[PDB]
Amino acid sequence: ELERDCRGQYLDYEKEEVEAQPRQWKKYDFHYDNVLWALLTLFTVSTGE
Amino acid sequence: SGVNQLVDIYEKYQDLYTVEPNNARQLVEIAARDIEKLLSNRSKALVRLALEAEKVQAAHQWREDFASNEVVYYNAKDDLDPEKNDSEPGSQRIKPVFIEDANFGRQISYQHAAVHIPTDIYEGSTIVLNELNWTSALDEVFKKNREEDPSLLWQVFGSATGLARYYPASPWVDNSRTPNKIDLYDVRRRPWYIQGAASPKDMLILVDVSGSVSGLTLKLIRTSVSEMLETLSDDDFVNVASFNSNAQDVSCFQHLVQANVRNKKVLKDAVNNITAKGITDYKKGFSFAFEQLLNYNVSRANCNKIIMLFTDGGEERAQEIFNKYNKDKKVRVFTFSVGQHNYDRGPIQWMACENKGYYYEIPSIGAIRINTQEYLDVLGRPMVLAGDKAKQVQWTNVYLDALELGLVITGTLPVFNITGQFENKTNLKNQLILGVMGVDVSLEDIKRLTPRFTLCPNGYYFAIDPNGYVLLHPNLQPKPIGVGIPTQEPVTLDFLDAELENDIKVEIRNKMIDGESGEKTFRTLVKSQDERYIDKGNRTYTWTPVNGTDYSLALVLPTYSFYYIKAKLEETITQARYSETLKPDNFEESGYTFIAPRDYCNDLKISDNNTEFLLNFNEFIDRKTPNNPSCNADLINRVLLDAGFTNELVQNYWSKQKNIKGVKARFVVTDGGITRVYPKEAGENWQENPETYEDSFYKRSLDNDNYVFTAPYFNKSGPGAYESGIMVSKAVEIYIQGKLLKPAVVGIKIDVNSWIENFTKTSIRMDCVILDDGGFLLMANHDDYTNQIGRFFGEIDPSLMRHLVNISVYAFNKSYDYQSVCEPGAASKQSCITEQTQYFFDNDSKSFSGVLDCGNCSRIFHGEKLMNTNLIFIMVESKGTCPCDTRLLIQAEQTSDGPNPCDMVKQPRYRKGPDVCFDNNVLEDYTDCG
Amino acid sequence: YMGKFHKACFPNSTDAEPVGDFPCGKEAPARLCEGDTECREYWPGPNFG
Amino acid sequence: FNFQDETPTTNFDTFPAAILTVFQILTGEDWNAVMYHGIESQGGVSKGM
Numbered sequence A: 001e002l003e004r005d006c007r008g009q010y011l012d013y014e015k016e017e018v019e020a021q022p023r024q025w026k027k028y029d030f031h032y033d034n035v036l037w038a039l040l041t042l043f044t045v046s047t048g049e
Numbered sequence B: 001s002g003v004n005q006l007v008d009i010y011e012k013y014q015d016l017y018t019v020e021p022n023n024a025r026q027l028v029e030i031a032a033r034d035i036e037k038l039l040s041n042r043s044k045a046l047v048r049l050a051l052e053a054e055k056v057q058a059a060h061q062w063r064e065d066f067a068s069n070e071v072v073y074y075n076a077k078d079d080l081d082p083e084k085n086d087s088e089p090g091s092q093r094i095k096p097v098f099i100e101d102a103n104f105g106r107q108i109s110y111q112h113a114a115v116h117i118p119t120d121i122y123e124g125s126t127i128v129l130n131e132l133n134w135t136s137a138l139d140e141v142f143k144k145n146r147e148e149d150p151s152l153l154w155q156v157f158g159s160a161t162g163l164a165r166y167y168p169a170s171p172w173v174d175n176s177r178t179p180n181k182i183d184l185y186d187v188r189r190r191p192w193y194i195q196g197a198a199s200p201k202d203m204l205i206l207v208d209v210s211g212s213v214s215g216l217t218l219k220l221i222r223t224s225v226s227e228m229l230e231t232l233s234d235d236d237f238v239n240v241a242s243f244n245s246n247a248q249d250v251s252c253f254q255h256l257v258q259a260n261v262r263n264k265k266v267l268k269d270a271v272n273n274i275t276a277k278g279i280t281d282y283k284k285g286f287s288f289a290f291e292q293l294l295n296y297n298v299s300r301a302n303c304n305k306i307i308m309l310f311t312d313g314g315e316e317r318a319q320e321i322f323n324k325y326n327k328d329k330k331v332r333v334f335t336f337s338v339g340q341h342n343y344d345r346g347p348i349q350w351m352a353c354e355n356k357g358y359y360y361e362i363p364s365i366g367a368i369r370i371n372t373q374e375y376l377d378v379l380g381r382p383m384v385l386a387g388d389k390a391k392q393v394q395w396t397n398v399y400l401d402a403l404e405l406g407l408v409i410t411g412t413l414p415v416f417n418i419t420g421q422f423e424n425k426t427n428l429k430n431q432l433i434l435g436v437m438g439v440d441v442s443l444e445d446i447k448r449l450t451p452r453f454t455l456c457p458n459g460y461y462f463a464i465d466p467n468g469y470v471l472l473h474p475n476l477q478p479k480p481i482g483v484g485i486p487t488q489e490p491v492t493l494d495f496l497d498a499e500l501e502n503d504i505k506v507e508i509r510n511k512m513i514d515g516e517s518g519e520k521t522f523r524t525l526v527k528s529q530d531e532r533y534i535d536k537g538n539r540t541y542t543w544t545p546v547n548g549t550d551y552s553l554a555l556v557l558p559t560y561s562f563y564y565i566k567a568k569l570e571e572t573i574t575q576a577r578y579s580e581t582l583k584p585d586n587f588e589e590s591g592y593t594f595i596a597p598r599d600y601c602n603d604l605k606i607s608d609n610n611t612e613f614l615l616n617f618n619e620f621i622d623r624k625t626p627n628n629p630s631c632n633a634d635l636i637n638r639v640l641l642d643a644g645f646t647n648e649l650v651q652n653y654w655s656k657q658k659n660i661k662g663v664k665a666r667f668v669v670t671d672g673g674i675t676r677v678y679p680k681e682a683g684e685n686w687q688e689n690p691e692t693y694e695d696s697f698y699k700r701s702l703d704n705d706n707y708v709f710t711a712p713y714f715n716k717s718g719p720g721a722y723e724s725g726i727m728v729s730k731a732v733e734i735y736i737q738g739k740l741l742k743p744a745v746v747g748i749k750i751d752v753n754s755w756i757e758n759f760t761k762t763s764i765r766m767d768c769v770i771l772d773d774g775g776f777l778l779m780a781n782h783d784d785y786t787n788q789i790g791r792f793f794g795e796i797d798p799s800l801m802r803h804l805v806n807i808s809v810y811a812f813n814k815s816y817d818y819q820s821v822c823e824p825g826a827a828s829k830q831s832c833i834t835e836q837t838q839y840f841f842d843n844d845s846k847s848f849s850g851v852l853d854c855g856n857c858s859r860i861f862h863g864e865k866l867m868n869t870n871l872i873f874i875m876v877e878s879k880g881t882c883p884c885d886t887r888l889l890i891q892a893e894q895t896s897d898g899p900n901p902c903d904m905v906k907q908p909r910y911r912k913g914p915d916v917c918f919d920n921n922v923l924e925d926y927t928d929c930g
Numbered sequence C: 001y002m003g004k005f006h007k008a009c010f011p012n013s014t015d016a017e018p019v020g021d022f023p024c025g026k027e028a029p030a031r032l033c034e035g036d037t038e039c040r041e042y043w044p045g046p047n048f049g
Numbered sequence D: 001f002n003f004q005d006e007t008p009t010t011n012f013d014t015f016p017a018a019i020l021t022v023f024q025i026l027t028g029e030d031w032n033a034v035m036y037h038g039i040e041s042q043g044g045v046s047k048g049m
Ligand SMILES: *[C@@H]1O[C@H](CO)[C@@H](O[C@@H]2O[C@H](CO)[C@@H](O)[C@H](O[C@@H]3O[C@H](CO)[C@@H](O)[C@H](O)[C@@H]3O)[C@H]2NC(C)=O)[C@H](O)[C@H]1NC(C)=O
Pocket: B661, B662, B663, B750, B751, B754, B755, B757, B758
């Protein structure tokens, strides 16, 4: 839960076979980090999708 | 064959050799001293390494900025391509020059140490970068250790941060960067790290199988309990209990059982079969756990009593149960909050605080592997505070090296945090070990301290643990121990499982575990190497304790092996004359010669392709005189002397006759290494081991003072029996100065047709079968059984075989092979336990007649045992009658689950635990519950 | 549309779970299988069936 | 709703969870996924429909 910690690779246990996947500090697609991003996020909320 | 001719050859040349004694007591004492010298050399290396590691970490200053000062290291999981762009932001990566070394069998760099970092662990972190900085001193000490002892194998620093820094820089095994090859290796889960990081445990894993753990949480709990069991060694004792309003054992075990592979699999299956249902009661589960930790009627590691609570959460701190059972706090309680949930974790975290434990969260698969390493991290607190008494070298069970070297043991030593000492500072986390130092000892490093070539093929050494597991044994193979029926663990084979178990052998095993020294001559049931025959052997076990270690070395030695032939070849031209008889050009004057691929010369490389090794051996014999300290004088002298002896038989007694109607191949095999077979046309069909000490017929024929008929293999596509013959062998029994020596085994590959004719020729003066020991069909007269030559009798006609067993002309011993590769059934080839049986002449009587009461009919048979050989003639006269062929006596490696471990933990084998262990210290800071 | 969501891309005779959560059709216009997989019957369907 | 490998956040275990799930079904978004979970929680297509 920190960007410092979130580097390198981790063992993914999703495909039922372990695979090393990169550790990426990503941001959610709709994220309120701005009054313009919040506007688009709330638009998607109002449409319900 | 020429038994008497070769005997006369041997006594005719008593001036060419000296009969020396195989003093078993002296041999065992010398080999035990050699083993303790090797292990003390490795212990000294470990002490050097741990001293420097503590000294250099204690003088390390923390940093959070390694860009201004990079750490230069070789990452083991790095591609050999010169990629300058493959450097982490905070570290410079070495690109090494790799030589190929025979001692390791891989690419090895002696200039620097390599570092393993788990994929789950980022190598640019502050923790890892600080470790990579202060471990370079370990690097140069690695170099010093190797230069003071060039025979050193891997010497490694397993760090508590996840890094493993091992000296000979070698790339990681196959998982550097490879699809389908993921590196799950973590040094803190290795058996040597776990062994050296704490004292033996007494876990009771409490599993919370109530309603609230259904679905994902139960899956995580069962995987977590499996991975928790996978950190338990053979000195730890474990039980798994589950509670939901009442506690019960998950498995057939009712008490703490030893955490060996088979018991651990029982517990793992019991956990996998567990179900979630009912309400929780943390009081009736902890009552059960504490009661089971107080059960002293059973074998235990009387140390480190633990409870591992695998719950999710709840609102029950269970004060009064802990007060009643854990008041002086002799038992630690580690609590795990498994799963992704919102239940109250407060009581779970408090149980860890009030009980010297630690609290862990496992929210998903992927967090499972690390928290277990962490309870081990907690358990080492009393070991650190017991500063230098704890730094004792321990030797791991035999296991398979990760960077493949086969079977190794490894000596461990904890490394402590020494930042504040005699300059006392806060010392916050100075209660944790820095890591464990390891040094590898190959089992082939021990096998050359126990030389077997002055011994009979039936004689050998073997060492033993205090658990009874063999450090050294001819029957211990580099394969994982089979654990049941198929659907990173030690190769722990017990002594009573490597051999055939008598009761004398159990007493000897207990005496060896106790560290006593003694001797015991007795009659054994020696199973043959091909694992189809059993001999009533006559052995002398002499054992000593290997001082300074918990091992115990013994020497098995037949009564006819107390003397051996030390070749007196010093004329330098007599041995040359014997040499020219070895060259692969005279394989029609002398027989088709095989030399045993032994370590005659340091520069000979042994090969399975025996003619290649024969060429190399002849080349080395050509120019030998300047090679005084390179070639083992005794082995080459013995093989040359025996080559001369077998030449004076293949020429002076076979080449003067050159052909006999009944034979198909005449062979002589010597304990020196020569296995000449005459015709060289049937010498191609000769498929016995070039090494004479690994020949099943040779060792079989030394026990019997008869002629041993080695039945061929049925349904085996190769040289066969019709076009190769069926083997007959007798061992020469020469006498020199009244000493019985059996230095060679002459033999005959009797032709099947020349013998079937003589079998049916005298019928004028149909069912008649020839059987040897083990009930194998040498042939019949029915000409349909002779199609199945060398097959077990019970496969052919089970009724008569079972009856003959019933009269006890054939006894049998059913045993378990724990190291057999296995075709996996359904609920490539895996490893299982096979259940192998061997038949043999039970009684010394010669004639056996009776009535075979087949169902609703009757059959009459007569069995007679041919004198001076291992054969029986069964004159059974009944064919095509009513079928009592209801089943079969399949004598083979029947895949089976081994002995019921539920039953053999109630009467377990004798076992000695570690003496000194560290728990329950008062200087300990229990306030780190996490 | 009766019973047309029951053929999935199954692996080669392994009888395991199919690859992809989509129906398939060995015919021409439908969605074909790929990766040495066969489009055979007895798959519960999309959305657990 | 404690299925294997997953517990949905749109469950009816607590009152906040149930109230949010019902509110989301009223707004209509992804009510079908919650329906699939509520069917598969009572035995699957065979007996939970
Ligand atoms: C079945 O076939 C022949 C029988 O025609 C067996 O050979 C004969 O075996 C008897 C055994 O009692 C010998 O006496 C016969 O002569 C012997 O030959 C040896 C050879 O060195 C002499 O040293 C003896 O002094 C004696 O003369 C022998 N005859 C021949 C021609 O071999 C044969 O062994 C048997 N087959 C098998 C496979 O056993």
